[PDB]
Amino acid sequence: GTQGERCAVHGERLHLFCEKDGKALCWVCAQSRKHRDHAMVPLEE
Ligand SMILES: [Zn+2]
Numbered sequence: 001g002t003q004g005e006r007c008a009v010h011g012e013r014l015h016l017f018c019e020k021d022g023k024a025l026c027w028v029c030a031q032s033r034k035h036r037d038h039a040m041v042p043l044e045e
Contacts, residue, residue: 005024007025007026007029010026010028012026012028013026014043015027015043016029016040017040017042017043018039018040019039019040019041020038020040021035024043025040027042030042
């Protein structure tokens, strides 16, 4: 019932939406050498 989906890997609040993956990441995961940056917009809600 945890109101607020945090990035559990690091232990921080997340704001990023992979449109390509259809998943909610953080800025740090946008900066990740893993995740191919293209269809990803930050959570501007
Ligand atoms: Zn992250």
